[PDB]
């Protein structure tokens, strides 16, 4: 369908000695494909999907250089922000950033993003126009004026519309056997008595990709939300995802209840009932 590339960076300061812990992860859609961890011995960007391994030495050097530079920038920023906010040297603090691009099924640019946070709260973000900045507070406002003077948004726009989209298209082609394959959910229903007169019906979706899914209960053909429980979508650990939704019902009335499953991999939604 449409596709995304996203990078997620986290720095966590280490009061008392040395540099922050820096972690970077890259995704295409919901597939991790690279990582960098400052705690790891390689000090290199490392592959996490088979289809990235073919990239040559220059790719790995360049990508390593980029994230190392960002880790240093984060270190500096952690210090200057601590100063701005008059915070002690004692506490650990964090900077996070997410950036990336979305492309349509024709491979054309749809949208770009570049947003960051300090201590888990919005700091500065590029707006959807890729021209303007959203600054959450007066430190970020200071940053905004600095980056306006330095043409930073222009650089980011050119990255997001250019490099980002070009490389995303490349990955989608190189990794097409998995990246452009949808794995529809494998579904089933379980039944768990909660007394001698009521039971939980749990509707399972397993082994699906991508992670986006909708699970709903209906009773007598209309959605029911009362007396239901919907768990957060969770990773299986093999690249696929899991979710379930449950409902408590009077025993003997199970045939009234139907579970409905919507996913990109299902041309029509699926309906399950208890046998």
């Amino acid at each position: 369908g449409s596709h995304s590339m996203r990078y997620f960076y986290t720095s966590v300061s280490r009061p008392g000695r040395g540099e922050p812990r820096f972690i970077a992860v890259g995704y295409v859609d919901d597939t991790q494909f690279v990582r960098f961890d400052s705690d790891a011995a390689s000090q290199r960007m490392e592959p996490r999907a088979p289809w990235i391994e073919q990239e040559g030495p220059e790719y790995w050097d360049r990508n390593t250089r980029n994230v190392k530079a960002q880790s240093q920038t984060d270190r500096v920023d952690l210090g200057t922000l601590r100063g701005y906010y008059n915070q002690s040297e004692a506490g650990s603090h964090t900077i996070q950033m997410m950036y990336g691009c979305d492309v349509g099924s024709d491979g054309r640019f749809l949208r770009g993003y570049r947003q960051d946070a300090y201590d888990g709260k919005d700091y500065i973000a590029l707006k959807e126009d890729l021209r303007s900045w959203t600054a959450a507070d007066m430190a970020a406002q200071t940053t905004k004026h600095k980056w306006e003077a330095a043409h930073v948004a222009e650089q980011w726009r050119a990255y997001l519309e250019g490099t980002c989209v070009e490389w995303l298209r490349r990955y989608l082609e190189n990794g097409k056997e998995t990246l452009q394959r949808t794995d529809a959910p494998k579904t089933h229903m379980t039944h768990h008595a909660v007394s001698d007169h009521e039971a939980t019906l749990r509707c399972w979706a397993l082994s699906f990709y991508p992670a986006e899914i909708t699970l709903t209960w209906q009773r007598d053909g209309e959605d029911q939300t009362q007396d239901t429980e919907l768990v957060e979508t969770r990773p299986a650990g093999d690249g696929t995802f899991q979710k379930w939704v449950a409902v408590v019902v009077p025993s003997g009335q199970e045939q009234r209840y139907t579970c409905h499953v919507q996913h990109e991999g299902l041309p029509k939604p699926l309906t399950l009932r208890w046998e």
């Binding site: 890259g26 240093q72 920038t73 920023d77 430190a139 980056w147 930073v152 490099t163």
Partner: peptide, 10 residues
């Protein structure tokens, strides 16, 4: 492919 853009905030 990562961004090469790494300007400081303050």
């Amino acid at each position: 492919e990562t961004s090469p853009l790494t300007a400081e905030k303050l």
